[PDB]
Amino acid sequence: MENFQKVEKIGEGTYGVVYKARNKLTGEVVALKKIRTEGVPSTAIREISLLKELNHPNIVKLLDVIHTENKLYLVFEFLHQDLKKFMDASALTGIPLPLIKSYLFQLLQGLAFCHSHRVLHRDLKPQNLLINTEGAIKLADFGLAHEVVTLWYRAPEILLGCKYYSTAVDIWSLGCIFAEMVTRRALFPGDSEIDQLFRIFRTLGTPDEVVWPGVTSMPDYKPSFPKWARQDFSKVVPPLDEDGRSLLSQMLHYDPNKRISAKAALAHPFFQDVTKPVPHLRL
Numbered sequence: 001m002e003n004f005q006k007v008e009k010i011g012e013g014t015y016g017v018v019y020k021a022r023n024k025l026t027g028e029v030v031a032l033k034k035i036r037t038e039g040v041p042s043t044a045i046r047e048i049s050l051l052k053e054l055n056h057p058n059i060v061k062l063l064d065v066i067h068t069e070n071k072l073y074l075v076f077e078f079l080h081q082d083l084k085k086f087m088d089a090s091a092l093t094g095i096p097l098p099l100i101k102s103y104l105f106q107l108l109q110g111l112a113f114c115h116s117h118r119v120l121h122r123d124l125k126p127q128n129l130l131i132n133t134e135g136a137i138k139l140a141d142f143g144l145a146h147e148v149v150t151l152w153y154r155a156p157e158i159l160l161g162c163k164y165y166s167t168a169v170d171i172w173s174l175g176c177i178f179a180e181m182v183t184r185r186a187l188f189p190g191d192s193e194i195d196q197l198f199r200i201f202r203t204l205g206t207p208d209e210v211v212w213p214g215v216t217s218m219p220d221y222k223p224s225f226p227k228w229a230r231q232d233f234s235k236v237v238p239p240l241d242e243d244g245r246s247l248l249s250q251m252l253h254y255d256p257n258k259r260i261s262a263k264a265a266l267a268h269p270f271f272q273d274v275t276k277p278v279p280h281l282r283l
């Protein structure tokens with residue numbers, strides 16, 4: 001862009017590469033995402049056209065949208081770090097619970113907002129969650145629909161072939177991220193769809209018509225799936241207190257309909273003593 005200069009390469013996203021650009025006119029630092037082009041669908045550009053209005057304190061703000069020379073550029077506000085990085089940086093001691101509680105609360109607020117507007121993220125993960133020195137965390141890289149995208153945060157209904165999945169898939173993803181912050185280890189680190197699915201089955205037990213009505217009708221559901229029993233949560237996410245564990249199990253419900261909503265989660269007693277701490281960030 002004439003008014004932008006790639007100051008750095010933040011990294012390749014899901015929809016294209018992300019560089020740290022400096023706006024030559026306003027002298028501001030932004031996150032420039034180069035979107036992948038053989039014409040660029042007019043229906044897609046209209047979808048992104050809405051996004052600029054979807055403004056929430058917990059959503060990385062989309063500053064502008066440049067569609068020049070059939071090339072699509074998305075300029076976002078620039079945050080200083082992602083949650084994945086922050087966690088690796090806290091691996092020795094682990095993020096303090098008050099911070100974990102604050103980030104979860106904020107993300108639930110953001111999700112509650114998107115969801116009330118019929119918008120799903122679809123691919124929530126640590127790397128898509130941006131944070132700042134102020135202590136805020138935001139949703140980024142929404143699913144606006146050659147590495148190795150992880151399936152670790154993928155909901156079971158998606159892995160089983162459900163096309164019209166709901167906003168519940170985001171709650172599942174956030175539930176996996178929540179558990180990860182607390183234990184400092186991914187909940188379900190699958191390396192293949194089938195592996196991902198079975199690691200989930202081995203922890204929450206293989207779902208059936210009892211815990212998940214209609215499950216045996218899923219497209220990729222095989223009657224030949226191994227039959228695992230459910231594991232105790234006290235063993236799965238220690239040392240999360242009962243309140244935390246209670247909320248987590250509700251976010252990890254098999255039946256998308258039984259899965260707790262973002263707004264409902266906000267009212268959970270776990271956030272009764274929620275505060276907004278400031279992180280010890282290293283930039």
Ligand SMILES: Cc1nc(C)c(-c2[nH]nc3c2C(=O)c2c(NC(=O)NN4CCN(C)CC4)cccc2-3)s1
Nearest residue numbers: 013014018031060076078079080081082127140141
């Ligand atoms: C580590 C890091 N250090 C900085 C300064 C980072 C950064 N600051 N502000 C942003 C970033 C982004 O990645 C980013 C962003 N990224 C994005 O959609 N692409 N991806 C980044 C990589 N992962 C695995 C998938 C999503 C979208 C809007 C704003 C920002 S990440």
